[PDB]
């Protein structure tokens, strides 16, 4: 019954710090830590709010050192590399650090501790740089579409920040949806609104379809790597719909005129593609059908 | 248009078991403070001929009804025909029957005195504790090691005459 | 009807269970699964009395009536050839 928080915390404190940092920690350290936090909470009346406040302070101090390290870079893109680099560790830490603080939870998903980390991180580092980080990402995707190949981790990390850092309980993905998704989408609509009418005039309609089916293949993959999957969100379907609207629907009339013709010329490989593309357009399939019965009338 | 039925699950009791249960409830509601907010409904207010009695015990917004039975056709060759109990948890035209164990656990959430969150820590610190659990009937499943541990140390309060427990009605 | 066991050798002890219908050999194989030593080196006892490999657990005088999860029966084990059966008692509570 001799030790309450004043004696103990100085033993606990360095270990919070190793854990915040990814610096190595031995099994008996971790166990001893567990024992220490618990003893502090059982024995001291002021003990737990005290563990909370000291925690809050130490987490800020290191988040701040982290910020120190990110914000030094003047370049718009070269900063991001360091951000991503700091982030992978920090996020893994958010899984690792709160666990010894379980009695802290019982004494008073979202631990107050994990919530606290991500929050402190949101106010301290991310909010200032976020527009910038996002912008660099749009440039990165733009680069990949044009064939410049790069490290996926950067785009993903920025998106992860947007998904995991969100504050409000009522909608978890709201801010992710309203910025990263909106911008990636607008990017898509304008990129393909520019590029699309061109390839058609160059390569012709039949080849246009072969090119379009393909761009759909390209982008659905790309959404899968870069976009939020794990939470089973609506995003990919929206990106996909948006692209289909761009690649197929805008041209829907011009394409369809070929159909009856290709029915007469008996080109099946072509019709498969027509139907495949159109199948996504909601009303897209029916005119091919009417065209077909109309051809069945005369044979 | 056809005969409609309402159907109940009924646990059996030996006749003396009912009398004990009845005297205990009436005793604790009216003759002591503990069970007063409970309601006891006699045999004559009840529209069903088979209903020996009922105890309506409010738990918050939903209420528990414990129904005792008469002149029933299960369990005996005797002239009075023998009888049983059933229990239901009712809120806003919703019903569930409830078994005796859960009945008691549920009653206990809302009624008699127990340990508070302070009690388990204070026991450790030597700060002592109030109050103590009465109504052992309220704890069923298995138990948190902590609860049971505490239980080795603090035996339950032991009221006389004992507070009503449905498991005691349905025992044997 | 399962019976529950602590197999206790030296300081180390194992919590496990088996059917009244299990044979001592089967258990020696399981102990092999845990401590990784083959079922020769092991010698299994009930008290000071050795257990026959081909005999069933209920037939060693272990019944589910005797061994309960709440209060398991102790077994004990022996390990270049053999060492005497040694079972290290648990710490005693102070006065």
């Amino acid at each position: 019954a001799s030790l309450q928080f004043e004696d103990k915390w100085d033993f606990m404190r360095p270990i919070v710090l190793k854990l915040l940092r990814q610096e190595s920690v031995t099994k008996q350290q971790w166990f001893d830590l567990f024992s220490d936090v618990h003893a502090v909470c059982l024995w001291d009346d002021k003990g737990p709010a005290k563990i909370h406040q000291a925690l809050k302070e130490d987490i800020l101090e290191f988040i701040k050192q982290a910020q120190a390290r990110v914000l030094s870079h003047q370049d718009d893109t070269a900063l991001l590399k360091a951000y991503i680099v700091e982030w992978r560790k920090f996020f893994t830490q958010c899984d690792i650090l709160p666990k010894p603080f379980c009695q802290l939870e019982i004494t008073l998903e979202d631990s107050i501790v994990r919530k606290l980390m991500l929050d402190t991180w949101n106010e301290s580092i991310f909010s200032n740089i976020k527009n910038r980080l996002q912008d660099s990402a749009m440039k990165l995707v733009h680069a990949e579409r044009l064939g410049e190949a790069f490290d996926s981790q950067l785009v993903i990390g920025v998106r992860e920040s947007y998904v995991n850092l969100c504050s409000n309980p009522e909608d978890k993905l709201q801010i992710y949806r309203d910025n990263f998704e909106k911008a990636y989408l607008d990017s898509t609509e304008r990129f393909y609104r520019t590029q699309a009418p061109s390839y058609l005039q160059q390569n012709g309609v039949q080849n246009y379809m072969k090119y379009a089916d393909a761009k759909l293949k390209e982008e659905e993959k790309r959404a899968l790597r870069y976009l939020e999957t794990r939470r089973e969100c609506n995003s990919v379907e929206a990106l996909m719909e948006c692209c289909v609207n761009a690649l197929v629907t805008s041209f829907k009339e011009t394409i369809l005129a070929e159909c009856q013709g290709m029915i007469k010329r008996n080109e099946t490989e072509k019709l498969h593609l027509m139907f495949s593309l159109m199948d996504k357009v909601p009303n897209g399939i029916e005119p091919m059908l009417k065209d077909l019965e109309e051809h069945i009338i005369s044979a | 248009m056809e005969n409609r039925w309402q159907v109940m699950i009924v646990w059996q009791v030996d006749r003396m078991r009912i009398n004990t249960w009845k005297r205990l409830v009436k005793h604790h509601m009216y003759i002591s403070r503990k069970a007063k907010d409970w309601f006891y409904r006699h045999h004559y207010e009840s529209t069903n001929p088979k209903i020996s009695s009922e105890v309506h015990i409010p738990l918050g917004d939903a209420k528990l009804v414990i129904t005792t039975y008469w002149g029933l056709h299960t369990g005996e060759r005797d002239w009075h025909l023998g009888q049983g109990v059933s229990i239901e948890w009712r809120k806003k035209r919703y019903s569930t029957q409830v078994d005796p164990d859960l009945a008691d656990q549920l009653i206990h959430l809302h009624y008699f005195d127990c340990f508070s969150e302070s009690a388990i820590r204070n026991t450790i610190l030597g700060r002592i504790v109030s109050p103590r659990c009465e109504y052992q009937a309220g704890h069923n499943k298995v138990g948190s090691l902590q609860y049971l541990a505490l239980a080795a140390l603090i035996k339950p309060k032991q009221i006389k005459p004992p507070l009503p427990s449905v498991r005691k009605l349905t025992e044997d | 009807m399962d019976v529950f066991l602590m197999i206790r050798r030296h300081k180390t002890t194992i919590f496990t269970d088996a059917k009244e219908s299990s044979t001592v050999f089967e258990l020696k194989r399981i102990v092999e699964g845990i401590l990784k030593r083959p079922p020769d080196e092991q010698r299994l006892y009930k008290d000071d009395q050795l257990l026959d490999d081909g005999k069933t657990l209920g037939e060693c005088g272990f019944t589910s009536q005797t061994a309960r999860p709440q209060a398991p029966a102790t077994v004990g084990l022996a390990f270049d050839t053999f060492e005497a059966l040694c079972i290290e008692p648990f710490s005693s509570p102070p006065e």
């Binding site: - | 056809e2 005969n3 409609r4 039925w5 309402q6 159907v7 109940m8 699950i9 009924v10 646990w11 059996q12 529209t47 069903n48 001929p49 088979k50 738990l59 917004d61 939903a62 039975y69 029933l72 056709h73 299960t74 369990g75 060759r77 049983g84 948890w89 809120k91 806003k92 919703y94 019903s95 569930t96 029957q97 409830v98 078994d99 859960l102 656990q105 549920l106 206990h108 959430l109 127990c114 340990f115 508070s116 969150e117 302070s118 009690a119 388990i120 659990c133 309220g138 704890h139 069923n140 499943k141 138990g143 948190s144 609860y147 349905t170 | -």
Partner: protein, 146 residues
């Protein structure tokens, strides 16, 4: 995902394990009366409006009483002659169930069991069903505050 939670207690829980077993049931009548009378009083009590019917699992201390509604239910003898069939939708410890069985008109011997009823659970309600689960879930120790 409210009903899969409901179903699972019906599937794994012991309470439902014993009752889902296809146990064998008897009708308890006026046992004092002889067999012929009993066959007759029983068939009447089914065909006529007002009598409570009692069926016991033979392996338990537990019983089923069909009370006349006057105090989806059915007791139906039209399905197969020389028999009476029984359907009892209930709700037991917060799971909606249906007990089905049949009774041999001659023997006054029969069969019955519990099957899970998804319909009631899809239909019943959100707030009330949930409230039951919330409450059934908790236990008193340590809830009260200091």
């Amino acid at each position: 995902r409210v009903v899969p939670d409901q179903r699972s207690k019906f599937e794994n829980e012991e309470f439902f394990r014993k009752l889902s077993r296809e146990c064998e049931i008897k009708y308890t009548g006026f046992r004092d009366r002889p067999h012929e009378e009993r066959q007759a009083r029983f068939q009447n009590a089914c065909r006529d409006g007002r009598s409570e019917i009692a069926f016991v699992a033979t392996g338990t201390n537990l019983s089923l009483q069909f009370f006349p509604a006057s105090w989806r239910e059915y007791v139906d003898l039209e399905r197969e002659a020389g028999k009476v069939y029984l359907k009892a939708p209930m709700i037991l410890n917060g799971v909606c169930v249906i007990w089905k069985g049949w009774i041999d008109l001659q023997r006054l011997d029969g069969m019955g069991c519990l099957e899970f009823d998804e319909e009631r659970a899809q239909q019943e309600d959100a707030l009330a069903q949930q409230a039951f689960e919330e409450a059934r879930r908790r236990t008193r120790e340590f809830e009260d505050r200091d």
